[PDB]
Ligand binder design. Structure first.
Ligand SMILES: O=C(O)/C=C/c1ccc(NC(=O)C2(NC(=O)c3ccc4c(C5CCCCC5)c5n(c4c3)CC(=O)Nc3ccccc3-5)CCCC2)cc1
Length: 551
């Protein structure tokens, strides 16, 4: 069947930002018929995944618990209420949610309406390698349906992927644990070979059978009878496909592939990618495979069989993936150094702690984080990618010297250090106070993230070249600015002094002895590196359990 069918109505609007103007180019790439042939390898992996899913017990969320997961600026319902009414448990919001739920239990077939929209994402215009990227498309149901998805499936999508995939499930790891996983897998092989597999338009490669196969896995959970019916009805009415409506309310067409804006997008994509990849590893006869899967993002670390044999087995792996309806964008390339593998737009790098001990860390090319931070500094944005980048890439030279220096001086100037901001962590929205950054970093990356030095020449040159390309002042200017930022933060005491002393310890001539922050343990990070929720409309406010008077 065709992934999409179009009426002809436009996808109307809601260095550079992507807009609805380029929607046509995206629509052309994502529209095609899918050819899928399954085999014994696929059926075997599937049964093994289901045997693991069978250990899961999922809870039905209450209306109140589902409403509390809703982002404050989540798109309003077409039924006379918004995200604020949902979060406040307004009678009108709650009544409509209960009627949407009742309708899921009673109606098993009528397709549910969705809105199709162009995503506005910032990228860096580089005329050296082609041109501009067309806008990505987002497909999502009404607010009432999104609350019902949480009730039926939040606990499933949060618990099931790790139980099924175990250590292969990428979203259970903090950046440091991901690095630890990849390094341990690499060191465990006699002669290691790794590769990243890039599926061309993954969401569009997802068939209605893949969506039913994914439901067959959810159905292995112990579920409340209403959760079991809601999952069944949501599968047939929403997940498998349905009609598309543009921002103007016009019939835009029809979808028979993965919706990017449903609660199950990340879980379904991870399970599907893993299933197809694990089966393709058997068909390719790859030896001692270790996989790391994050939605459509796949990395495979295996045992090398020789240079020519590795190239041959990768072409065979690709053939199997293609039969399973997952053909590649860029064909996969065998790598023999762990640092050369780009996965989830990131790579492993190593540095030293204050004692000369080696520390592995996750980094990436800083162009897109710097261009997005420049955009966010220029105009008010709903999400602060700069904050999420500081959190995820805290050990990096670029996040420490540039992002921390720039943003802490702006916050000092605006007197907004305590003002909570929204950022995305594995697709989920977190409301975080910049004053909590030292404690967050210590908890995720360890105390060493504040003492890292001996960065690699390759990483230093990538950062320096990027600063030059973007007209950003060089590293020595940042060191000078961080000294003043640090002195002003130290002068304020409390959490602000801790920001100065810990985040900017790299900036001083004579480096301080840093002891662990006592209040860091109080932070409730329980929901942090559990699962992926990209397009899942998930929100959390950072909380502190058991506060001591003196902190
Ligand atoms: O000794 C030497 O050899 C060099 C000395 C030297 C060179 C340039 C400066 N620049 C500045 O002072 C100013 N800009 C900056 O001090 C500046 C700060 C952050 C900047 C950023 C990002 C970096 C990440 C956080 C968000 C801001 C960008 N650009 C920045 C410029 C350059 C810019 O204007 N825009 C972009 C566009 C895309 C990406 C980055 C940038 C402020 C007043 C005058 C212009 C200062 C000193």
């Amino acid at each position: 069947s065709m992934s999409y069918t179009w009426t002809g109505a436009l996808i109307t609007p809601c260095v550079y930002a992507t807009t609805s103007r380029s929607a046509s180019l995206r629509q052309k790439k994502v529209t095609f018929d899918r050819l899928q042939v399954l085999d014994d390898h696929y059926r075997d992996v599937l049964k093994e995944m289901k045997a693991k899913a069978s250990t899961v017990k999922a809870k039905l969320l209450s209306v109140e618990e589902a409403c509390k997961l809703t982002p404050p600026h989540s798109a309003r319902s077409k039924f006379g209420y918004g995200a604020k009414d949902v979060r406040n448990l307004s009678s009108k919001a709650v009544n409509h949610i209960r009627s949407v739920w009742k309708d899921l239990l009673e109606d098993t077939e009528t397709p549910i309406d969705t809105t199709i929209m162009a995503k506005n994402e910032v990228f860096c215009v580089q005329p050296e390698k082609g041109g501009r990227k067309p806008a990505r498309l987002i497909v999502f149901p009404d607010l009432g349906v999104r609350v019902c998805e949480k009730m039926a499936l939040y606990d499933v999508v949060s618990t099931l992927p790790q139980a099924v995939m175990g250590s292969s499930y990428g979203f259970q790891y903090s950046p440091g644990q991901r690095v630890e996983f990849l390094v341990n897998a690499w060191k465990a092989k006699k002669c290691p070979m790794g590769f990243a597999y890039d599926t061309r338009c993954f969401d569009s490669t997802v068939t209605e059978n893949d969506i039913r196969v994914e439901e067959s896995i959810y159905q292995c959970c112990d579920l409340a009878p209403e959760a079991r019916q809601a999952i069944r009805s949501l599968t047939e009415r929403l997940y498998i496909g349905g009609p598309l409506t543009n921002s103007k309310g016009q019939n835009c067409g029809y979808r028979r592939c993965r919706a990017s804006g449903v609660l199950t997008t990340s879980c379904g994509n991870t399970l599907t990618c893993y299933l197809k990849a694990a089966a393709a590893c058997r068909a390719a006869k790859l030896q001692d495979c270790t996989m790391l899967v994050c939605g459509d993002d796949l990395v495979v670390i295996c045992e090398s069989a020789g240079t020519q044999e590795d190239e041959a087995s990768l072409r065979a792996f690709t053939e199997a993936m293609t039969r399973y309806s997952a053909p590649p964008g860029d064909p996969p390339k065998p790598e023999y150094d762990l640092e050369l593998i780009t996965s989830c737009s990131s790579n492993v790098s190593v540095a030293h702690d204050a004692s000369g001990k080696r520390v592995y860390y996750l980094t990436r090319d800083p162009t897109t984080p710097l261009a997005r931070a420049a955009w966010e500094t220029a105009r008010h944005t709903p999400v602060n990618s700069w904050l999420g980048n500081i959190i995820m890439y805290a050990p990096t030279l670029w996040a420490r010297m540039i992002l921390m220096t720039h943003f802490f001086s702006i916050l000092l100037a605006q007197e907004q250090l305590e003002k909570a901001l929204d950022c995305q962590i594995y697709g989920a929205c977190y409301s975080i106070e910049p004053l909590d950054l030292p404690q967050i970093i210590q908890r995720l990356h360890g105390l060493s993230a504040f003492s890292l030095h001996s960065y690699s020449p390759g990483e230093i040159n990538r950062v320096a070249s990027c600063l030059r390309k973007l007209g950003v002042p060089p590293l020595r200017v940042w060191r000078h600015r961080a000294r003043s930022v640090r002195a002003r933060l130290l002068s304020q005491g409390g959490r602000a002094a801790t920001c100065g002393k810990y985040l900017f310890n790299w900036a001083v001539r004579t480096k301080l002895k840093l002891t662990p922050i006592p209040a860091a343990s109080q932070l409730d990070l329980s929901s942090w590196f559990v699962a992926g929720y990209s397009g899942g409309d998930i929100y959390h406010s950072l909380s502190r359990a058991r506060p001591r008077w003196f902190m």
